[PDB]
PDB file of all heavy atoms in Angstrom:
ATOM      1  N   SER A  35      18.936 -29.504 -28.774  1.00 52.68           N
ATOM      2  CA  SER A  35      17.565 -29.147 -29.078  1.00 52.68           C
ATOM      3  C   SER A  35      16.739 -28.911 -27.812  1.00 52.68           C
ATOM      4  O   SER A  35      15.960 -27.959 -27.721  1.00 52.68           O
ATOM      5  CB  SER A  35      16.919 -30.229 -29.950  1.00 52.68           C
ATOM      6  OG  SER A  35      17.261 -30.064 -31.303  1.00 52.68           O
ATOM      7  N   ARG A  46      18.104 -16.266 -25.453  1.00 67.69           N
ATOM      8  CA  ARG A  46      19.263 -16.265 -26.312  1.00 67.69           C
ATOM      9  C   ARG A  46      20.205 -15.089 -26.046  1.00 67.69           C
ATOM     10  O   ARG A  46      21.319 -15.080 -26.615  1.00 67.69           O
ATOM     11  CB  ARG A  46      18.826 -16.235 -27.796  1.00 67.69           C
ATOM     12  CG  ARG A  46      18.048 -17.480 -28.217  1.00 67.69           C
ATOM     13  CD  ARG A  46      17.793 -17.476 -29.714  1.00 67.69           C
ATOM     14  NE  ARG A  46      18.612 -18.500 -30.410  1.00 67.69           N
ATOM     15  CZ  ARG A  46      18.153 -19.692 -30.783  1.00 67.69           C
ATOM     16  NH1 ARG A  46      16.897 -20.028 -30.543  1.00 67.69           N
ATOM     17  NH2 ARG A  46      18.971 -20.541 -31.394  1.00 67.69           N
ATOM     18  N   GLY A 185      16.751 -36.845 -22.879  1.00 28.04           N
ATOM     19  CA  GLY A 185      15.780 -37.065 -23.929  1.00 28.04           C
ATOM     20  C   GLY A 185      14.425 -37.547 -23.446  1.00 28.04           C
ATOM     21  O   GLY A 185      13.465 -37.588 -24.205  1.00 28.04           O
ATOM     22  N   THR A 186      14.329 -37.924 -22.149  1.00 29.72           N
ATOM     23  CA  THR A 186      13.044 -38.292 -21.565  1.00 29.72           C
ATOM     24  C   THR A 186      12.115 -37.104 -21.445  1.00 29.72           C
ATOM     25  O   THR A 186      10.888 -37.262 -21.497  1.00 29.72           O
ATOM     26  CB  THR A 186      13.252 -38.960 -20.211  1.00 29.72           C
ATOM     27  OG1 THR A 186      14.095 -40.097 -20.335  1.00 29.72           O
ATOM     28  CG2 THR A 186      11.911 -39.387 -19.637  1.00 29.72           C
ATOM     29  N   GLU A 308      10.509 -74.937 -28.024  1.00 41.91           N
ATOM     30  CA  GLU A 308      11.661 -74.152 -28.501  1.00 41.91           C
ATOM     31  C   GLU A 308      11.268 -72.947 -29.287  1.00 41.91           C
ATOM     32  O   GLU A 308      10.179 -72.899 -29.888  1.00 41.91           O
ATOM     33  CB  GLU A 308      12.555 -75.076 -29.335  1.00 41.91           C
ATOM     34  CG  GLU A 308      11.830 -75.788 -30.434  1.00 41.91           C
ATOM     35  CD  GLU A 308      12.573 -76.980 -30.984  1.00 41.91           C
ATOM     36  OE1 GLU A 308      12.767 -77.960 -30.218  1.00 41.91           O
ATOM     37  OE2 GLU A 308      13.008 -76.940 -32.134  1.00 41.91           O
ATOM     38  N   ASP A 366      31.495 -70.549 -36.012  1.00 29.02           N
ATOM     39  CA  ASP A 366      30.750 -71.114 -37.140  1.00 29.02           C
ATOM     40  C   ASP A 366      29.286 -71.315 -36.799  1.00 29.02           C
ATOM     41  O   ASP A 366      28.649 -72.230 -37.373  1.00 29.02           O
ATOM     42  CB  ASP A 366      31.395 -72.448 -37.611  1.00 29.02           C
ATOM     43  CG  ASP A 366      31.549 -73.440 -36.474  1.00 29.02           C
ATOM     44  OD1 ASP A 366      31.378 -73.061 -35.312  1.00 29.02           O
ATOM     45  OD2 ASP A 366      31.838 -74.624 -36.744  1.00 29.02           O
ATOM     46  N   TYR A 372      17.512 -68.537 -37.782  1.00 30.66           N
ATOM     47  CA  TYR A 372      17.289 -69.921 -38.147  1.00 30.66           C
ATOM     48  C   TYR A 372      17.598 -70.942 -37.087  1.00 30.66           C
ATOM     49  O   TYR A 372      17.270 -72.148 -37.267  1.00 30.66           O
ATOM     50  CB  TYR A 372      18.087 -70.289 -39.401  1.00 30.66           C
ATOM     51  CG  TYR A 372      17.574 -69.744 -40.690  1.00 30.66           C
ATOM     52  CD1 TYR A 372      18.413 -69.168 -41.633  1.00 30.66           C
ATOM     53  CD2 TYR A 372      16.191 -69.833 -40.985  1.00 30.66           C
ATOM     54  CE1 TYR A 372      17.908 -68.662 -42.832  1.00 30.66           C
ATOM     55  CE2 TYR A 372      15.700 -69.326 -42.164  1.00 30.66           C
ATOM     56  CZ  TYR A 372      16.543 -68.762 -43.094  1.00 30.66           C
ATOM     57  OH  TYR A 372      16.075 -68.277 -44.276  1.00 30.66           O
ATOM     58  N   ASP A 398      15.258 -51.276 -13.733  1.00  8.06           N
ATOM     59  CA  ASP A 398      15.666 -50.317 -14.734  1.00  8.06           C
ATOM     60  C   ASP A 398      14.600 -49.290 -14.860  1.00  8.06           C
ATOM     61  O   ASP A 398      13.580 -49.454 -15.531  1.00  8.06           O
ATOM     62  CB  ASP A 398      16.037 -50.977 -16.072  1.00  8.06           C
ATOM     63  CG  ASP A 398      16.562 -49.980 -17.080  1.00  8.06           C
ATOM     64  OD1 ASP A 398      15.801 -49.094 -17.500  1.00  8.06           O
ATOM     65  OD2 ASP A 398      17.771 -50.045 -17.375  1.00  8.06           O
ATOM     66  N   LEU A 671     -18.213 -72.127 -11.264  1.00 47.27           N
ATOM     67  CA  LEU A 671     -19.350 -72.939 -10.933  1.00 47.27           C
ATOM     68  C   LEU A 671     -18.975 -74.423 -10.975  1.00 47.27           C
ATOM     69  O   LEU A 671     -19.504 -75.216 -10.188  1.00 47.27           O
ATOM     70  CB  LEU A 671     -20.509 -72.650 -11.865  1.00 47.27           C
ATOM     71  CG  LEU A 671     -21.228 -71.296 -11.609  1.00 47.27           C
ATOM     72  CD1 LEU A 671     -22.356 -71.108 -12.616  1.00 47.27           C
ATOM     73  CD2 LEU A 671     -21.731 -71.215 -10.184  1.00 47.27           C
ATOM     74  N   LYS A 676     -19.365 -82.832  -8.369  1.00 51.65           N
ATOM     75  CA  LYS A 676     -18.802 -83.956  -7.613  1.00 51.65           C
ATOM     76  C   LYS A 676     -17.301 -84.140  -7.779  1.00 51.65           C
ATOM     77  O   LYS A 676     -16.563 -84.126  -6.805  1.00 51.65           O
ATOM     78  CB  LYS A 676     -19.558 -85.238  -7.974  1.00 51.65           C
ATOM     79  CG  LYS A 676     -19.289 -86.390  -7.034  1.00 51.65           C
ATOM     80  CD  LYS A 676     -19.632 -87.721  -7.690  1.00 51.65           C
TER      81      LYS A 676
ATOM     82  N   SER B  35      30.341 -76.644 -41.662  1.00 46.88           N
ATOM     83  CA  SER B  35      30.310 -77.484 -40.482  1.00 46.88           C
ATOM     84  C   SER B  35      29.140 -78.445 -40.539  1.00 46.88           C
ATOM     85  O   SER B  35      29.255 -79.636 -40.176  1.00 46.88           O
ATOM     86  CB  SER B  35      30.255 -76.660 -39.185  1.00 46.88           C
ATOM     87  OG  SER B  35      31.461 -75.953 -38.990  1.00 46.88           O
ATOM     88  N   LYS B 179       8.047 -77.571 -37.669  1.00 49.21           N
ATOM     89  CA  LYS B 179       9.167 -76.680 -37.869  1.00 49.21           C
ATOM     90  C   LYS B 179       9.516 -76.573 -39.351  1.00 49.21           C
ATOM     91  O   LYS B 179       9.420 -77.566 -40.078  1.00 49.21           O
ATOM     92  CB  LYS B 179      10.414 -77.126 -37.085  1.00 49.21           C
ATOM     93  CG  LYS B 179      11.515 -76.094 -37.122  1.00 49.21           C
ATOM     94  CD  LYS B 179      12.826 -76.656 -36.551  1.00 49.21           C
ATOM     95  CE  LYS B 179      12.878 -76.615 -35.045  1.00 49.21           C
ATOM     96  NZ  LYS B 179      14.233 -76.966 -34.586  1.00 49.21           N
ATOM     97  N   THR B 186      19.149 -74.408 -39.135  1.00 49.66           N
ATOM     98  CA  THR B 186      18.066 -74.930 -38.344  1.00 49.66           C
ATOM     99  C   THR B 186      18.258 -76.424 -38.053  1.00 49.66           C
ATOM    100  O   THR B 186      17.813 -76.940 -37.009  1.00 49.66           O
ATOM    101  CB  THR B 186      16.704 -74.700 -39.028  1.00 49.66           C
ATOM    102  OG1 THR B 186      16.572 -73.324 -39.382  1.00 49.66           O
ATOM    103  CG2 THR B 186      15.549 -75.090 -38.095  1.00 49.66           C
ATOM    104  N   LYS B 311       9.233 -47.485 -23.042  1.00  2.00           N
ATOM    105  CA  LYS B 311      10.524 -47.099 -23.615  1.00  2.00           C
ATOM    106  C   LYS B 311      10.643 -47.634 -25.042  1.00  2.00           C
ATOM    107  O   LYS B 311      10.225 -48.780 -25.337  1.00  2.00           O
ATOM    108  CB  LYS B 311      11.683 -47.580 -22.779  1.00  2.00           C
ATOM    109  CG  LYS B 311      12.116 -46.630 -21.689  1.00  2.00           C
ATOM    110  CD  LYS B 311      13.280 -47.247 -20.903  1.00  2.00           C
ATOM    111  CE  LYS B 311      13.826 -46.292 -19.839  1.00  2.00           C
ATOM    112  NZ  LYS B 311      14.186 -47.027 -18.626  1.00  2.00           N
ATOM    113  N   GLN B 357      12.338 -36.619 -26.467  1.00  8.39           N
ATOM    114  CA  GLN B 357      13.074 -36.028 -27.585  1.00  8.39           C
ATOM    115  C   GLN B 357      13.090 -37.007 -28.758  1.00  8.39           C
ATOM    116  O   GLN B 357      13.990 -37.864 -28.858  1.00  8.39           O
ATOM    117  CB  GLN B 357      14.486 -35.632 -27.172  1.00  8.39           C
ATOM    118  CG  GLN B 357      14.601 -34.344 -26.366  1.00  8.39           C
ATOM    119  CD  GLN B 357      14.002 -33.167 -27.096  1.00  8.39           C
ATOM    120  OE1 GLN B 357      13.213 -32.392 -26.522  1.00  8.39           O
ATOM    121  NE2 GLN B 357      14.311 -33.031 -28.371  1.00  8.39           N
ATOM    122  N   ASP B 367      18.071 -35.451 -34.641  1.00  4.73           N
ATOM    123  CA  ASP B 367      18.480 -35.064 -33.266  1.00  4.73           C
ATOM    124  C   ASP B 367      17.604 -35.707 -32.200  1.00  4.73           C
ATOM    125  O   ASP B 367      17.403 -35.126 -31.129  1.00  4.73           O
ATOM    126  CB  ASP B 367      18.455 -33.540 -33.139  1.00  4.73           C
ATOM    127  CG  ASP B 367      17.100 -32.922 -33.407  1.00  4.73           C
ATOM    128  OD1 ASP B 367      16.285 -33.559 -34.098  1.00  4.73           O
ATOM    129  OD2 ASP B 367      16.868 -31.795 -32.928  1.00  4.73           O
ATOM    130  N   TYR B 373      15.864 -43.866 -23.465  1.00  2.49           N
ATOM    131  CA  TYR B 373      15.365 -42.705 -22.714  1.00  2.49           C
ATOM    132  C   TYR B 373      14.096 -42.078 -23.263  1.00  2.49           C
ATOM    133  O   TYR B 373      13.543 -41.192 -22.591  1.00  2.49           O
ATOM    134  CB  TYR B 373      16.461 -41.612 -22.645  1.00  2.49           C
ATOM    135  CG  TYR B 373      17.580 -41.912 -21.668  1.00  2.49           C
ATOM    136  CD1 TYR B 373      18.877 -41.511 -21.932  1.00  2.49           C
ATOM    137  CD2 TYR B 373      17.327 -42.580 -20.472  1.00  2.49           C
ATOM    138  CE1 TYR B 373      19.905 -41.799 -21.060  1.00  2.49           C
ATOM    139  CE2 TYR B 373      18.351 -42.843 -19.571  1.00  2.49           C
ATOM    140  CZ  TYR B 373      19.626 -42.423 -19.885  1.00  2.49           C
ATOM    141  OH  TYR B 373      20.650 -42.709 -18.985  1.00  2.49           O
ATOM    142  N   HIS B 524      15.226 -18.730 -33.367  1.00 54.24           N
ATOM    143  CA  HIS B 524      14.359 -19.918 -33.530  1.00 54.24           C
ATOM    144  C   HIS B 524      13.931 -20.468 -32.198  1.00 54.24           C
ATOM    145  O   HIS B 524      14.541 -20.278 -31.138  1.00 54.24           O
ATOM    146  CB  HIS B 524      15.095 -20.999 -34.314  1.00 54.24           C
ATOM    147  CG  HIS B 524      15.946 -20.517 -35.452  1.00 54.24           C
ATOM    148  ND1 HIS B 524      15.390 -19.946 -36.601  1.00 54.24           N
ATOM    149  CD2 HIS B 524      17.270 -20.481 -35.621  1.00 54.24           C
ATOM    150  CE1 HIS B 524      16.369 -19.608 -37.403  1.00 54.24           C
ATOM    151  NE2 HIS B 524      17.527 -19.920 -36.834  1.00 54.24           N
ATOM    152  N   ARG B 631     -23.095 -82.819  -7.962  1.00 41.76           N
ATOM    153  CA  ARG B 631     -23.636 -83.576  -9.088  1.00 41.76           C
ATOM    154  C   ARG B 631     -22.520 -84.036  -9.982  1.00 41.76           C
ATOM    155  O   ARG B 631     -21.449 -83.374 -10.110  1.00 41.76           O
ATOM    156  CB  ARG B 631     -24.644 -82.752  -9.921  1.00 41.76           C
ATOM    157  CG  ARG B 631     -26.102 -82.822  -9.511  1.00 41.76           C
ATOM    158  CD  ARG B 631     -27.043 -82.725 -10.717  1.00 41.76           C
ATOM    159  N   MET B 671     -18.063 -69.687 -15.264  1.00 30.81           N
ATOM    160  CA  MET B 671     -18.468 -68.448 -14.623  1.00 30.81           C
ATOM    161  C   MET B 671     -18.184 -68.540 -13.137  1.00 30.81           C
ATOM    162  O   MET B 671     -18.323 -69.608 -12.513  1.00 30.81           O
ATOM    163  CB  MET B 671     -19.939 -68.179 -14.861  1.00 30.81           C
ATOM    164  CG  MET B 671     -20.325 -68.205 -16.319  1.00 30.81           C
ATOM    165  SD  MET B 671     -21.920 -67.449 -16.625  1.00 30.81           S
ATOM    166  CE  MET B 671     -21.501 -65.713 -16.570  1.00 30.81           C
TER     167      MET B 671
END
Side-chain angles (χ1 to χ4, degrees), chain A residues 35 46 185-186 308 366 372 398 671, chain B residues 35 179 186 311 357 367 373 524 671:
Chain A
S35 278
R46 297 187 108 100
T186 303
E308 52 198 66
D366 53 349
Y372 284 136
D398 184 292
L671 286 180
Chain B
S35 291
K179 188 190 279 188
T186 308
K311 270 180 176 141
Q357 281 304 132
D367 59 338
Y373 284 145
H524 322 290
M671 308 195 78

